[PDB]
Amino acid sequence: SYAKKPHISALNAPQLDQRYKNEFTIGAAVEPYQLQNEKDVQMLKRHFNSIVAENVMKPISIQPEEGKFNFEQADRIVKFAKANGMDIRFHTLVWHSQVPQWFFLDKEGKPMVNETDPVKREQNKQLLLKRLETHIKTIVERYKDDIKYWDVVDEVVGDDGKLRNSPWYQIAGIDYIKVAFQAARKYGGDNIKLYMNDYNTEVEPKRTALYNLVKQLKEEGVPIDGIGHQSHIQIGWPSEAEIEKTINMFAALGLDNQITGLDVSMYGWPPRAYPTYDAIPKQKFLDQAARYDRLFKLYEKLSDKISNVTFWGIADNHTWLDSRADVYYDANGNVVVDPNAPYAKVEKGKGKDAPFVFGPDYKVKPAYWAIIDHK
Ligand SMILES: [Cl-]
Ligand SMILES: [Cl-]
Ligand SMILES: [Zn+2]
Ligand SMILES: [Zn+2]
Ligand SMILES: [Zn+2]
Ligand SMILES: [Zn+2]
Ligand SMILES: [Zn+2]
Ligand SMILES: [Zn+2]
Ligand SMILES: [Zn+2]
């Protein structure tokens, strides 16, 4: 939406959170160093009223060795949010990636997944669940008064629609999910809100598997308050109709919905990225702006079912999507971005994506104008 609207500094632009303040909070994912950068601080103060840590609250960042808790980085994000009246989301108590390996070693130091004795396997289950409870207990006892929203587990359902067969599941079975939510509620009390977070929540068979899993857990009294939809999406996928169907499906269970990691990639999958920001054609930003226009129109339509929309970053100069921005080169060394076209080599993660409404120079994109207006 719209091109005659100018490329002005985002620090001079109408505030994004204020535009949406009766519909949902507007969040950004951050690293501690961005809180030491004048531009990023001014962006967070101007446009956002919710915050989450990109990385410093993940299990391996918090407890890299058993008994060694590293809260200093997480504390800095909590401090900044309190000083600026921001909601905080905790990402994340449990995840199969970025996972300290000590969790899954038995008393003899051997991988628990390798045990064959059923009596010893049950001992490893109880030991892993005890470690899980202590991890969650320590974090929630520190932050329960400060952090309202918790990703209790991330990505526990596989893309094949079965439970993800991570070491958590191999060793402890489904109970690791139940234990995590129960521990968060026990040590955090009734006022913190507990979420199951995942990507491709719109895609079958994952969508209905997520639905059935959460429905069953709530029937058994496991405290789950909502679903986090990571929403790592593309310009043309998934459809707005399928997003709407997903959000309604989970709201029908009585669950809150949060959009927890929104980015709108310029590319498909696997991505064939441009090598630099400057090489991305202007038309891509117009296509992106129209996608954002439709997306936030839908979020507003469903505002009674969505409490928060968080972007997985601040401005286009920093996005984890760049780690996926593979650049394909033909035999003559020219960039290939056509997903079917011939090519000779790929430089993995060397390109540039552009997923936000704010450009890498902190000036507003067409996508910003598309979601700040009321059309
Ligand atoms: Cl990143
Ligand atoms: Cl620019
Ligand atoms: Zn308004
Ligand atoms: Zn504000
Ligand atoms: Zn450049
Ligand atoms: Zn709402
Ligand atoms: Zn980052
Ligand atoms: Zn610019
Ligand atoms: Zn609009």
Side-chain angles (χ1 to χ4, degrees), residues 31 54-55 312 318-321:
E31 297 275 28
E54 278 195 356
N55 285 294
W312 206 250
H318 184 102
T319 165
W320 84 297
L321 292 187

Side-chain angles (χ1 to χ4, degrees), residues 276-279:
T276 68
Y277 201 92
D278 300 331

Side-chain angles (χ1 to χ4, degrees), residues 110-224:
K110 176 116 191 301
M112 291 180 168
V113 289
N114 294 167
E115 181 59 39
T116 55
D117 174 1
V119 157
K120 208 273 190 150
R121 285 192 62 84
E122 178 68 18
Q123 291 171 343
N124 292 339
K125 171 183 177 166
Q126 300 304 318
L127 175 61
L128 177 61
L129 295 175
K130 164 168 71 114
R131 293 162 170 179
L132 174 60
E133 172 160 351
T134 300
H135 182 79
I136 289 170
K137 168 181 181 297
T138 303
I139 294 158
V140 173
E141 287 176 327
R142 187 174 183 83
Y143 292 128
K144 62 168 204 292
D145 294 328
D146 304 313
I147 299 186
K148 186 182 198 167
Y149 300 105
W150 294 75
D151 289 345
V152 175
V153 301
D154 282 56
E155 300 178 12
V156 300
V157 172
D159 290 315
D160 63 359
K162 322 275 180 33
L163 287 147
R164 184 184 292 279
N165 200 44
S166 69
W168 289 112
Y169 186 69
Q170 295 175 63
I171 297 158
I174 198 168
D175 283 335
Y176 86 90
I177 299 171
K178 311 186 183 190
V179 156
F181 280 97
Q182 294 286 11
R185 177 67 69 224
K186 169 182 183 165
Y187 300 104
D190 289 21
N191 294 157
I192 64 167
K193 301 283 159 173
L194 309 177
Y195 292 76
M196 176 177 296
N197 191 64
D198 220 324
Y199 65 91
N200 287 5
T201 55
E202 314 81 5
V203 182
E204 294 295 354
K206 183 184 225 173
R207 174 165 66 189
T208 297
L210 281 176
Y211 178 86
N212 292 337
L213 171 67
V214 169
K215 180 171 193 298
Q216 177 206 346
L217 292 172
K218 287 188 79 40
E219 279 169 355
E220 308 182 5
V222 175
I224 306 173

Side-chain angles (χ1 to χ4, degrees), residues 63 65-69 102:
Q63 205 185 175
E65 312 168 34
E66 189 177 7
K68 293 327 188 189
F69 289 89
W102 67 262

